[PDB]
Design a protein around this ligand. Sequence first.
Ligand SMILES: Nc1ccn([C@@H]2O[C@H](COP(=O)(O)O[C@H]3[C@@H](F)[C@H](n4cnc5c(=O)[nH]c(N)nc54)O[C@@H]3CO)[C@@H](O)[C@H]2O)c(=O)n1
Length: 105
Amino acid sequence: ESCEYTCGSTCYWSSDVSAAKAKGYSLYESGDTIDDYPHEYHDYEGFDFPVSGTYYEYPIMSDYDVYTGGSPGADRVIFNGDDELAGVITHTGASGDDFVACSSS
Ligand SMILES: Nc1ccn([C@@H]2O[C@H](COP(=O)(O)O[C@H]3[C@@H](F)[C@H](n4cnc5c(=O)[nH]c(N)nc54)O[C@@H]3CO)[C@@H](O)[C@H]2O)c(=O)n1
């Protein structure tokens, strides 16, 4: 129950991240979307993610429910077509539609 990632003030447990990615990926895999998620993520920000691209983003929710439509909020789980985790990012602390990385702890 440690915070794998911390987005602004939000604590995500490894299980939170995994469930988000898992959802995002099962959709990616079928070629489906839910309110435009998962979305390809360009990485214009320049994050040097530990896994290779291309990357996809899927909302990760501060209430810990898996995204299934509606407002996506400020946080995103980044994964690739091999279901690998790249990271967790957020709009929280960034200027607009731009992102900043979530910290570990
Ligand atoms: N400060 C903010 C800003 C947006 N949000 C919500 O975020 C969503 C949409 O955000 P998001 O999923 O990131 O939508 C982004 C992505 F899907 C898409 N995209 C693709 N590649 C990239 C990239 O490298 N960078 C980037 N910033 N956006 C990208 O480009 C749009 C941004 O222009 C919306 O409902 C907003 O209400 C928020 O809660 N707080």
